[PDB]
């Protein structure tokens, strides 16, 4: 009724306000910036997965890395010696995400079973066992990310995100503003805000404290699969099944730069930044990964070392590597 | 060289052997999807077997089947359907018996059969509620959903046309074989076993070069 007219008026107000701030685009501003053509190479192959690899996450020490694959396997590796450290047997092989806690004590996993399993690594007994099972989520998990050793946020195709309390096991904040399926998720360094890109073609910056959505961006034509924070905390880039990546600034609330090429018509599955927020690394599903200069919006490198879709990728906190896990069942560390 | 990293590579090789041993018994159970509109008795067929994704495993003639039911997920299908790339077969359920539209099931089959993740995965079609369909078609013409043709109003005729249409939904005919069926049907899991054995033989011939 009148609200529909009111809703349209509010949307028009938002659009006009957004258009007002557009002082300039990254093209003109960054024209006076030197492009990075980096070409990493396989320094280690991490074999031992017998099925598709969807998830990886880098440990905080830039030394260990965890990989979740359809083999019902969550392998904790050693990036240098390649000697596998742990092999956690997941009780639900349909995993779509994993996360390595900042303190290294815990590791996250989750997937079509829409149960966020928090596994405990450092225990008196040698084995690695599951600590908590975060349930009550009517979609499928897509990305878990630890805030501390007791708080984790999980996004699902349940049109909802959630901040939990691993101690009590009960969802303590529900983030429900979207209208499609939330496919990605990433935490700001402050661990006070986080972004989630959904199948609505929209991304959203939320507020873990207040318990309420803060900003919604719409710059894409189809499902979003990846989103990751620019390490300064107030920007984030994202990738969509429409073969395009876009950069957003949370304070500017607008779209800033686009990353696409005419030849590529494939999809995107993971996006991560460099340590300095200069290299935008994105895992396309044309059987290889891509590397851009986010600021200059120019193609700068290809990680073509797989025979299947490059699903997940991550960059160490030390910044001295990048690990890509594709559907070829092989992790690959590049430097 | 190595001081106690020599004892770390030992642990690595031990758990690598454990992974290889698990994969031997992981690639031993034949994986098998299950889909449907929701009114179709996929619940019925899983009940007759000798939240989130539902797992069901069973045995028949020393072949371990593992069925995956996902209809409990009311999410975007184009995001969790690619995880089931390696499934040997897809059991599809369609209810022959027009409560709302049936056309939805036909649209679903086209979205599964012609889906790019299933070009070589056979689909075991399952027309359910055969008894109700036979007792129903007399009371209501088949034209209400099939204006084009209703033909003879006996079950052995109308169901023949529905089956013919569903086969005709095959966007590709070279690879996929739609092992259709009807189902109190006690010989059902045997039919799934025959279809899966045929698919396994076809795959063995394919990677052996004879196809």
């Amino acid at each position: 009724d009148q609200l529909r007219q009111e809703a349209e008026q509010l949307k028009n107000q938002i659009r006009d306000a957004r258009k007002a701030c557009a002082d300039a685009t990254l093209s003109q501003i960054t024209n006076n910036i030197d492009p990075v053509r980096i070409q990493m190479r396989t320094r280690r192959t991490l074999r031992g997965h017998l099925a598709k690899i969807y998830a990886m996450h880098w440990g905080t020490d830039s030394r260990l890395l965890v990989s979740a694959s359809q083999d019902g396997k969550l392998i904790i590796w050693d990036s240098y010696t390649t000697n596998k450290v742990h092999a956690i047997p997941l009780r639900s092989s349909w995993v779509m995400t994993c996360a390595y806690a900042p303190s290294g004590n815990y590791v996250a996993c989750g997937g079509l079973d829409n149960i966020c399993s928090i596994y405990n690594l450092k225990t008196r007994e040698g084995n690695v066992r599951v600590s908590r099972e975060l349930a009550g989520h009517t979609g499928y998990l897509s990305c878990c990310r630890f805030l501390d050793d007791n708080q984790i946020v999980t996004s699902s195709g349940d049109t909802t995100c959630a901040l939990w309390d691993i101690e009590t096991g009960q969802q303590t904040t529900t983030f429900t503003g979207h209208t499609g399926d939330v496919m990605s998720l990433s935490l700001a360094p402050d661990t006070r805000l986080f972004v989630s890109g959904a199948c609505d073609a929209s991304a959203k910056l939320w507020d873990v404290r207040e318990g309420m959505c803060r900003q919604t961006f719409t710059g894409h034509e189809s499902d979003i699969n990846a989103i990751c924070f620019f390490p300064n905390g107030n920007a984030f880039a994202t990738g969509s099944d429409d073969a395009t990546c876009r950069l957003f600034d949370l304070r500017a609330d607008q779209e800033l730069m686009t990353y696409s090429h005419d030849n590529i018509i494939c999809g995107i599955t993971s996006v991560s930044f460099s340590k300095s927020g200069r290299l935008l690394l994105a895992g396309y599903d044309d059987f290889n990964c891509n590397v851009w200069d986010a600021l200059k919006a120019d193609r700068a490198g290809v990680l073509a070392g797989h025979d299947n879709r490059v699903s997940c990728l991550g960059v160490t906190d030390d910044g001295m590597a990048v690990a890509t896990g594709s559907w070829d069942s092989f992790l690959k560390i590049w430097n | 060289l190595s001081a106690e990293d020599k004892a770390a590579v030992e642990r690595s090789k031990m758990i690598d052997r454990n992974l290889r041993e698990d994969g031997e018994k992981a690639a031993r159970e034949v994986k098998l999807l299950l889909l449907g509109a929701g009114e179709s008795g996929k619940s019925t067929i899983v009940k007759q077997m000798k939240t989130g994704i539902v797992e069901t495993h069973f045995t028949f003639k020393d072949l371990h089947f593992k069925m995956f039911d996902v209809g409990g997920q009311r999410s975007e299908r184009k995001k969790w359907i690619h995880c089931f790339e390696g499934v040997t077969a897809i059991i599809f359920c369609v209810a022959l018996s027009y409560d709302l539209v049936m056309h939805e099931s036909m649209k679903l089959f086209d979205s599964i059969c012609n889906n790019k993740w299933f070009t070589d995965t056979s689909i075991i079609l399952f027309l359910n509620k055969k008894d109700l369909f036979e007792e129903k078609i007399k009371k209501s013409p088949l034209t209400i959903c099939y204006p084009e043709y209703a033909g003879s109003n006996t079950y052995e005729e109308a169901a023949a046309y529905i089956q013919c249409q569903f086969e005709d939904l095959n966007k590709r005919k070279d690879t996929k074989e739609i092992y259709t069926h009807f189902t109190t049907d006690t010989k059902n899991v045997q039919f799934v076993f025959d279809a899966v054995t045929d698919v396994i033989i076809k795959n063995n011939l394919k990677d052996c070069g004879l196809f």
Partner: single-chain antibody
Amino acid sequence: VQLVESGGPGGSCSASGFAFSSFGMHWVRPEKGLEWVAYISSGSGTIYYADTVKGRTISRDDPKNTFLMTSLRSEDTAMYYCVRSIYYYGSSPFDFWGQGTTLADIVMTQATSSVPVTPGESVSISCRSSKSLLHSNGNTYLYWFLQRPGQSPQLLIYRMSNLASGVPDRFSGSGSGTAFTLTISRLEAEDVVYYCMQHLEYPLTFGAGTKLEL
């Protein structure tokens, strides 16, 4: 986390509470000192015996989660100790020392025994080794064990810098090259001899030990 074992002239570890099948196992040897006995790893792949008693036997069973010599040599009259050590990155080998029972290569010299120490004061214990204890990977190998009187040894500082679970944060160890040290800041009554350990080579020599009188 619970190792109890049993045993005893002329002729000749019921582990519980942890995943034995993925842990290495040693043995360690009179009211004088301690020295290495044998070794085994997960899966019974690599077995090192002590040079002094080479070829005279260690053997484990994982389903049973547990066995151990042939000649009653004079030096064999001692108190043998049972330890576990899982070897992966960032682990704490020799973490748990069992109670134990009764019955060339790098060597460490201390010669600093009998240092009298009072509560509340800070104390330091030295440790000199023959060669350098630093593999090329960056790890310095020294496992500062404390032997409280009438009790099994305990790990304080594994790999010469890291601190093991349960140890209060007052303990700390350092020292590079060959000469090492262990430091206690606020000594307490339950902190009353200290034993070094090398791990670069197969023979796990210890060193004499420095008793702290209180």
